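Changelog-linked ticket: magnesium ion example.
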Amino acid sequence: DIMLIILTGLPGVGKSTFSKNLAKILSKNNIDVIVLGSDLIRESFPVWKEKYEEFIKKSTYRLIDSALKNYWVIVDDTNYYNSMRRDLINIAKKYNKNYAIIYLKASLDVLIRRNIERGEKIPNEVIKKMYEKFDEPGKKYKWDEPFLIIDTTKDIDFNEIAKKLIEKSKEIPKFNISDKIDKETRKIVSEYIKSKKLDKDKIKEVVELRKEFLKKIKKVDADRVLKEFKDLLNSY
Amino acid sequence: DIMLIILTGLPGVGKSTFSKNLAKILSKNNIDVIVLGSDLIRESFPVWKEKYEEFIKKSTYRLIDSALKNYWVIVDDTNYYNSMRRDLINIAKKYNKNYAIIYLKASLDVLIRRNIERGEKIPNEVIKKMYEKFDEPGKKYKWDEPFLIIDTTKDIDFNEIAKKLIEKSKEIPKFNISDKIDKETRKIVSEYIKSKKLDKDKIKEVVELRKEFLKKIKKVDADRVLKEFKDLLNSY
RNA sequence: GGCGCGGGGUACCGGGCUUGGUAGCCCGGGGCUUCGGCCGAGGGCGAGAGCCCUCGGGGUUCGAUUCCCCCCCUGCGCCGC
RNA sequence: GGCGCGGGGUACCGGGCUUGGUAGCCCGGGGCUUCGGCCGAGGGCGAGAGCCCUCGGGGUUCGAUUCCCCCCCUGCGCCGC
Ligand SMILES: Nc1ncnc2c1ncn2[C@@H]1O[C@H](COP(=O)(O)OP(=O)(O)OP(=O)(O)O)[C@@H](O)[C@H]1O
Ligand SMILES: Nc1ncnc2c1ncn2[C@@H]1O[C@H](COP(=O)(O)OP(=O)(O)OP(=O)(O)O)[C@@H](O)[C@H]1O
Ligand SMILES: [Mg+2]
Ligand SMILES: [Mg+2]
């Protein structure tokens, strides 16, 4: 009963602290889970250069891809774009494992407060830019729907979230004659019409006649039935 | 000028703190270096089970293997067995990169002190068991020689260690007629001896005669020369 | 640290290869020396020129650098999680 | 969030397929009904039985569920590092 748990949300919301507690409790229920995020590797360098980013991503993924085979992974990343959550979902997909988006939610102002409280190690306007740029889980894709939405300002029940989750892990992942007779009578009708120069009124008649011929048949040998039809019109 | 820097030493010695400072200074010299160790992953789980160890090792290696292609790696592990340092050396080998063992050294008692000071989060007798089990760098293999031996009790010069290192990165990694005539005369001698029933004294003579025939030749046409020899003995 | 393997233990110093004939050849480095070439150490005898003895121990042998068992120096394999 | 694609916008509810003949068939689900079968909504007329009109907007058309342009509902693609 393994599954990829895809946290999501802006910085300051409390993903890491969440992860740790979720992990700890989950593990209290004898479940082997590892917590992975790009920061794990981002912060192994002694400084940040944009060029590290290519490596940090490829590495963090391989990590996740590799771990999921054997363990619950809790992905501790911001995951703001929906392609980001797809990219993760695809690893789960690859191994046919369940997943669970968890949208640690909080209003821009509690976020702005929380950054400030953290010494604004990130320009406040970047929380604000990450806000206006965040893709709401589920707003565009049904696969993207949050399995949960946690309010971080409020107290937080991990016994409950654990319960709910394992329950989820228990799922297996969610990843002619009548035609010929019909479409061939339509054709015969388009001939008789477009050939016998019927007027609108007799048009409607043969049309209804066809619908009524058809009702009788349902109540059966294609060719037989079509001469039958051709005949019916000749008469009428 | 990339290279794998293989720290080594017991727990309590100060590898991680060392790594950080070494990295920081190295990076001050505009060198892209990442610090990797199995603990990076060991401590992403919320608890320790022996079964995690298979995964932690395979993962930590792939990490190192992957990073070395682009960056200096500083391996922050205990690396107590010599096969352990080989296993690392082999990744460097694989990519033809230099390496540098760094033996953060300290006596068992400073180690015992340091553990105690860390609240003996590891049974003192396991530092002591890791001591009696540690393989001294270089004691068995020349490839295993320490490029450096740091004393942790003492102050510590990273400007110097940085200097020394990059200097090291600047290296490119360190990874018949006369016979026939000789061995064929030996044979002719073993015949003449084992056939002409020579006594020990005449044995020595033909032997010396051979060594003297040979000296003349050096001063040349195999077959020619060997009839020449066969002749020389017939006479003598 | 186990258990193993290679090279060396012959002679200017390294490295490699060949060999039951007292060793030999190849590559790199050094030395003496007309020319040709030549070469290390300890002990004994000799004014000297020179001569004897040895080259880690043991055995197969006329003869071991080579084959075999110990051992020392080197270098390396796997593994010791 | 860009730019796109599929399904639906006809009628018991879902899902799929076929089709210029007023729609049809397949699978899953529900309802009424002797038997055979039958079915959704709004408006107008009718005591009633029943009858007229409409099914998002527009055009090619006798005729559009189908072809074409808007739009709404669904579901999805790539990408937005
Ligand atoms: N419920 C809370 N109330 C107040 N402050 C909080 C709360 N949760 C987290 N924080 C603060 O937010 C800061 C970020 O820590 P944490 O790792 O929890 O954040 P995060 O949002 O997961 O980080 P990231 O930017 O990777 O998402 C911490 O300093 C922490 O004190
Ligand atoms: N020079 C030093 N003097 C005193 N204490 C030290 C010194 N260096 C490290 N320590 C202590 O040793 C403890 C271990 O920290 P550190 O990460 O430096 O150790 P470590 O030996 O690298 O860990 P590991 O067990 O992974 O080798 C730390 O709590 C630190 O305070
Ligand atoms: Mg964090
Ligand atoms: Mg440490």
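Closing comment: Example verified and attached. Chain B has two domains: 4-171, 178-236. The beta strands of chain B are 3-8, 33-36, 72-75, 98-105, 148-151.
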